[PDB]
Amino acid sequence: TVSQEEMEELRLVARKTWRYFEDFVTEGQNYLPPDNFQEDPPNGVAERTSPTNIGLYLVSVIGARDLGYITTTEMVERIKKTLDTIEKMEKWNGHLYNWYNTKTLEPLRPYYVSTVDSGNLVGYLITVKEAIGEFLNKPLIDIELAKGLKDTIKMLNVKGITEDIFTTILSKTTLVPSEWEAFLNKIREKLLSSQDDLENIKRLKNIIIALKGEMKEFLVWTEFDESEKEQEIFKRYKEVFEEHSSPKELEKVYKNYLLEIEEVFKKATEEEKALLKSQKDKVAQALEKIKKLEAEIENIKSTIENLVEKTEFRHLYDEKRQLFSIGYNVEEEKLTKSYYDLLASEARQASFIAIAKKEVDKKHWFKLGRMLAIENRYKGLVSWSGTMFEYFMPLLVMRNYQNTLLDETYAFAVRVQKNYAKELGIPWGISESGFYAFDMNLNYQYKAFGVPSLGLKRGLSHDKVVAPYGSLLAIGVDVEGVLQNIRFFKKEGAEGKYGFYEAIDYTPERVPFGKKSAIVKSFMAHHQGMVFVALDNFINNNVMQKRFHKDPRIKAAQILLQEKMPMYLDITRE
């Protein structure tokens, strides 16, 4: 069990991690996240993005709202725009390409379609589809938007603006808009006075501008002048405006106030009619906006659903090997030689969604290579690399059922990975990450760092590159362990503006002499996403998972994860 103090830290890290997207997903990047931002070598923000990057941002957006880092409106918006962009991008049989340029929105040079990239993205979309609906009956003013600002405040740090400020508001199971209006303005005021870094101040203003923004627009019952507040009609509806702040709970309250305005408009003074008329006219638009919000949502859900059923996975499957190829090389109009011949592989998310879409046989799932490695007692599927990501990238959306083959394995991985790492005295979670070497232009290189045990086919080496993203991608399992790693990462200085730096390179060959560890002063959008989502997942009981499985086609197949690990196994040969 996690202490409130503990959680608060995890939440802050989530906030810092979300910031990546806040900051680098620009109009200019066509509302896509760019692969990475490099700090120390300050080459800045790389203007390329992968299907996966994009998907993880979209599900992160949802995740943002979950923690209270954006508003219901803000949410829908970013998704709308990002999707508008997606609906543009040069596709292949309804697939996104390997890479696009964030500005040219052009397929990048080695015109390629990655199976995994598509597979992941599709999943992340399906997740968003089943999720976004929820927010039509989830309050525009809910407590989480305050729990959220708390994290925002801790992060931004601007004088008088301190954590304790909250206390009261957060002490209540519910947030009552009046208290909120007050609290938001109180904070607006101590900001006008506090003379910290104008820049830092600005952000908190705009993040308080955003919060009142939703409220003024959608809860216009705050913007009725003292004479309008008198109209008896208002004094019946006062406690029902406070008791209901969801877009549908408002849609209903707002009509029933607009039909009652109409009724009592005949039995009213010309003074009472002018005041009743002002209130009709405001609450009218306020409804028209809710109708639009509801619509923009369905358009999203529909647009997503489409883009998914448009994605022809058929094309990346060698029917004859009953197996998924790495991806399609568009330049030789040929499918790639090698394949995802293993269950323990990010490919599963691809492999699963295919069967769930009924694009390949339910059998495919069982043709994927299942290899156990019995280490000490614990047994578990080996992967092609040993990267935590190979095992846990699915677990963002793909569920885990207890005692299942996967389950045994998901634990197995954490153990071996933590042993390997304690036996090297580095924090655990060695996975595909950047490391302290650079191309001619001084950009951190990025390579597959497994543990060679879980690494069916591995060059061993010292390659001691611990990436935090991999550690956190398993919060689910050894929360205790991951927490330790996080402290250990802070002490080794991996803490930064946008959460945890890409990786720490302990590798002898590459560490600068008279130093141990070369922190890869980088933030990679895809990894940032995984961390963010994985945190949300941990905090709100595998939410994103339960949303992905809210999809019927997914629920159709959900039994495949409930595969149990066999009790007997032959050993002979021929």
Numbering used by the authors: 1011 to 1584
From the paper:
A ligand-free structure of TiCGSCy was determined at 3.9 Å resolution. An asymmetric unit contains almost identical four molecules (RMSD, 0.3 Å). The enzyme consists of a single (α/α)6-barrel domain with several inserted α-helices. Structure-based multiple amino acid alignment suggests that the additional α-helices in the middle region is unique to CGSs, and they are not found in SGLs. A large pocket observed in (α/α)6-barrel domain is expected to be a substrate binding site of TiCGSCy. The shape of the substrate pocket of TiCGSCy is similar to those of TfSGL and CpSGL in that the substrates observed in TfSGL and CpSGL complex structures can be potentially accommodated in the pocket, although the superimposed glucose moiety at subsite − 3 is a little too close to TiCGSCy. There is a sufficient space beyond 2-hydroxy group of the potential subsite − 4, which is consistent with the fact that TiCGSCy prefers Sopns with larger DPs. Contrarily, W1394 is likely to block binding of glucose moieties beyond subsite + 3. Taking into account the result of action pattern analysis that subsite + 4 should be occupied, side chain of W1394 may flip to make room for substrate binding. In the case of TiCGSCy, E1442 is found with a clear electron density at the position corresponding to that of the nucleophilic water in TfSGL, which attacks the anomeric carbon of the glucose moiety at subsite − 1.
Cyclic β-1,2-glucan synthase (CGS) is a key enzyme in production of cyclic β-1,2-glucans (CβGs) which are involved in bacterial infection or symbiosis to host organisms. BaCGS is composed of three regions responsible for the following steps: initiation (covalent bonding of glucose to CGS), elongation of linear β-1,2-glucan (LβGs) chains, adjustment of chain lengths of the glucans, and cyclization of the glucans by transglycosylation. Here we performed functional and structural analyses of the cyclization domain of CGS alone from Thermoanaerobacter italicus (TiCGSCy). In the present study, we explicitly showed that TiCGSCy domain alone produced CβGs by transglycosylation reaction without hydrolysis.
